[PDB]
């Protein structure tokens, strides 16, 4: 992540991020709604950071330092460039909505009143079709990526040294290769939980309540389509094992 965004989302909540004199100008219901929107953006910033560790630290480091067989790096990090493009674009829209809402003279005081429309746009049309295609592919290749990682770490000395080197810093404690893969697979199922809680505190404006209700339905439709489109790929699986599913 870049320092400007890390600092903007360093606080544990929106109520601790804004100036206390600005917080005191709002009703409790607005504070509750803003705290959950802040958690959605903060966790999205961390999710894009997980994807950058996978593309920049691991994938590109293996290509530039190691002598792996062709197709091995793609097997460890399936769809990571596509996932990075989807979420970096979504994060850009969330951060621009926050930036437009800032009070003049402030880099921290804002209220986002219109998130629903942004979520309907993200979870409909071509961006939803790309999310469905990419997660159906990624999640079907998840078990294979973990098995490939374990085989390389146990048998290739230079690979083991590389992993131990780049994951030694304390800031990588939660972000080993296998941890990154499961953080990405679990991201999509966090959205309904966050959206439902924002919706609970968005009844003040009926158009906003309706828009978040529509967004929640679109997110659940996407998840149901991805879940129905998954079948774990296995290296060396025979056709007979596949058609006898």
């Amino acid at each position: 992540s870049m320092e400007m965004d890390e600092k903007d989302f360093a606080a544990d909540s929106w109520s601790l991020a804004v100036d206390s004199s600005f917080l005191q100008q709002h009703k409790k219901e607005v504070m509750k709604q803003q705290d959950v929107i802040y958690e959605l953006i903060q966790t999205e910033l961390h999710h894009v950071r997980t994807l950058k560790i996978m593309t920049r630290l691991f994938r590109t480091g293996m290509l530039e330092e190691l002598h792996l067989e062709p197709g091995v790096v793609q097997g460890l990090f399936p769809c990571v460039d596509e996932l990075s493009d989807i979420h970096t674009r979504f994060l850009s829209q969330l951060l621009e909505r926050r930036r437009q809402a800032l009070c003049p003279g402030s880099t921290r005081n804002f209220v986002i009143h219109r998130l629903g429309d942004l979520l309907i746009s993200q979870f409909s049309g071509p961006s939803a079709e790309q999310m469905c295609k990419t997660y159906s592919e990624f999640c079907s290749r998840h078990s294979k990526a973990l098995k490939l990682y374990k085989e390389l770490y146990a048998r290739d000395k230079r690979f083991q040294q590389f992993i131990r080197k780049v994951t030694r810093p304390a800031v990588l404690k939660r972000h080993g290769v296998q941890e990154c893969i499961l953080l990405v697979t679990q991201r999509i199922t966090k959205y309904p939980l966050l959206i439902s809680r924002i919706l609970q505190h968005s009844h003040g404006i009926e158009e906003e309540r309706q828009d978040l209700t529509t967004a929640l339905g679109l997110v659940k439709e996407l998840l149901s389509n991805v879940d129905e489109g998954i079948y774990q790929l296995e290296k060396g699986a025979r056709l007979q094992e596949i058609y006898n599913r």
């Binding site: 909540s13 109520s15 958690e39 941890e179 499961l182 697979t185």
Partner: protein, 179 residues
């Protein structure tokens, strides 16, 4: 320090997310309780042994039968949760959660955990449950279910007050270390 993996399972109302949040911060949040939990790697020393215990939540995956199992590879210990204020969450343990965990995590120890133990003697909880001819889960009902399902053990805790939370994760670490 050896690395071990813990996964918590249970119904949406069992309090699994809150339990992981309270343990990982050693505090019940005073300003904002997070809606979701990403992951965490806890440094735990139990009976003289140092372990890095990676913690994972299955919240949000309950309705997605092909996404949910992706949380299980290489799990070393399962916390199988129910809420003491919800006998319905306890009824779903033996024939939904238990067969799934035994299938994807063979031979992995399961600790059955009764969450929200502070609500056992809460008057509002007792009034609400009595309308459906129910009462808070009794300790013997929890122990009997743990015995029936082949659990390694039965424990209770309250994420709200933190009582019993440290003991659950220290025991899970001991279970993860056993042969």
């Amino acid at each position: 320090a050896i690395r071990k993996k813990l996964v918590i399972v249970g119904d949406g109302a069992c309090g699994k997310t809150c339990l992981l949040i309270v343990f990982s911060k050693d505090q019940f949040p005073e300003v904002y309780v997070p809606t979701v939990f990403e992951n965490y790697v806890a440094d735990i020393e139990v009976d003289g042994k140092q372990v890095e215990l990676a913690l994972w939540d299955t919240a949000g995956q309950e309705d997605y039968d092909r996404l949910r199992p992706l949380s299980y590879p290489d799990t070393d210990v399962i916390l199988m949760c129910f809420s003491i204020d919800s006998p319905d969450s306890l009824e779903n343990i033996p024939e939904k959660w238990t067969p799934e965990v035994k299938h994807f995590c063979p031979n992995v120890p399961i600790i059955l955990v009764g969450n929200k133990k502070d609500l056992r003697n809460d008057e509002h909880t007792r009034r609400e449950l009595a309308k459906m001819k129910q009462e808070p889960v009794k300790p013997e009902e929890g122990r009997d279910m743990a015995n029936r399902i082949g659990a390694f053990g039965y424990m209770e805790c309250s994420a709200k007050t933190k009582d019993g939370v440290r003991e659950v994760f220290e025991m899970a670490t001991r279970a993860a270390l056993q042969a």
